[PDB]
Amino acid sequence: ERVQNSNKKEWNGMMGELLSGQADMIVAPLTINNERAQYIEFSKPFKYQG
């Protein structure tokens, strides 16, 4: 989302802690999207669901 009423878009929540260096792996039910896969590498995905 576009935060701080300016031209800056930061990533809320869990994925921001991956981007900011608070962690190095996310092991959770985290889906595969087009918006997250712009700069976050994923793996072969555990399961198949909808």
Binding site: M25, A28, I32, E41, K44, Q49, G50
Partner: peptide, 27 residues
Amino acid sequence: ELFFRSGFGIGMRKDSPWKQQVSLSIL
């Protein structure tokens, strides 16, 4: 019925050296 078929994956930082190891053993 289902709409948006995908799967939960392990989220890593971009270009960490584990990107080839953890993608193998899962398979």
